[PDB]
C-alpha cells in the first residue's frame, strides 16, 4: 500500500491496457480497458493531472467478466488546448479509496 | 450451428469488440479484442474477405482470463492499397474449425 499523492496505491488494482492511447479533449468517447479482478459495484475509472480530475462514466453492466471496463471519458478541463495533453488514468475503489498505478492517455485538440 | 461460407458459425464464440477499428495494411500491429470464454489452446483470430485470409499471431499467454486476446495483425494481401479496406475479423476454434460472427476491421494505406 504505497502513497501516491493524495491517495494510496495497491498492487491489487491494475489496468493492463486501455484500448486507445489518445482521444478528443471533448470527452464523451466510449472506451474500454483491461484490468485485474474488480468489484463491479466498488470501482471507478479516473483521469487526472497533478491539479485536475475527472471521473469516467459507466454502469456496473459495463464491467465485463471483472477483467474489463467499458466507459465514457470525461471531457478535459480545457477544451481549448492547442496541443496534446497526456493525463493519468487509474482505477479507484470507492469504499477505501485505494487506487491502482496510472496509465497514460493523451487528450487531443478538438 | 449456422453455415457461413466455407465454415460454420456458433453462438458459443463471440468477439464483443476490437480495441481499434482500423490499422495499417502493413500489419504487425499489436491489438486486442474482448470475447466470451475461449480455450487458450484451441482458438485463433482470423482476418478475411470473400477471397483472402490471414491469421493473427498470438500465444496462449496472450489470452487474458479467457475473455480477451492480445495479438499481432497479419499484413493485408495488398500493401499497395490506395483506399481503406474493411475486412472481417473472427474467432475460429482449431479443433472443429467452428467460427464466431465476424467484426469489421479496416486496413489503411501505408
Scanning A4-43 for CB atoms below 8 A from B yields: 16-17, 19-20, 32, 34
In chain A, domain spans: 1-110
Which grid coordinates belong to B32?
486486442
Encode chain B in three state secondary structure.
CEEECCEEECCCCCEEEECCCEEECCCCCEEEEEECCCCCCCCEEEEECCCCEEECECCHHHEECCCEEEEECCCCCCCCCCCCEEEEEEEECCCCCCECCCEEEEEECC
Question: How far apart are alpha carbons B92 and B44 in whole angstroms?
Answer: 5
Closest to A104 (Cα-Cα) out of A15, A6, A2: A15
User: Resolution reached, in Å?
Assistant: 2.4
Q: Which residue has the cell 467484426?
A: B103
Is the CB of residue B46 less than 8 Å from the CB of residue B92?
A: yes
Is the CB of residue B44 less than 8 Å from the CB of residue B59?
A: no
Cβ atoms < 10 Å from Cβ of A31: 19
**Closest-approach residue (CA) in chain B for A34:** B68
Question: How far apart are alpha carbons B2 and B4 in whole angstroms?
Answer: 6
**Domain B1-110 falls in which CATH fold?**
Immunoglobulin-like (2.60.40)
Question: How far apart are alpha carbons A50 and A85 in whole angstroms?
Answer: 13
Shortest distance, CA A20 to any CA of chain B (angstroms):
7
Is the CB of residue B56 less than 8 Å from the CB of residue B30?
A: no
Maximal CA-CA distance, chain A: 38
Experimental method: X-ray
Query: Which residues are within 8 A (CB) of A103 and not within 5 positions of it... i.e. 6 or more apart?
Result: A15, A17, A18, A33, A88, A89, A90
Amino acid at each position: 500500500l504505497v502513497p501516491r499523492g493524495s491517495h494510496m496505491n495497491t498492487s491489487e488494482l491494475r489496468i493492463c491496457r486501455i484500448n486507445k492511447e489518445s482521444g478528443p479533449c471533448t470527452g464523451g468517447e466510449e472506451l474500454f480497458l483491461l484490468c485485474d479482478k474488480v468489484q463491479k459495484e466498488d470501482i471507478s475509472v479516473v483521469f487526472s493531472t497533478a491539479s485536475w480530475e475527472g471521473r469516467a462514466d459507466f454502469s456496473q453492466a459495463d464491467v465485463h467478466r471483472q477483467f474489463a471496463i467499458v466507459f465514457k471519458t470525461p471531457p478535459y478541463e480545457d477544451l481549448e488546448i492547442s496541443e496534446p495533453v497526456t493525463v493519468n488514468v487509474f482505477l479507484q475503489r470507492l469504499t477505501d479509496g485505494v487506487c491502482s498505478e496510472p496509465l497514460p492517455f493523451t487528450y487531443l485538440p478538438r
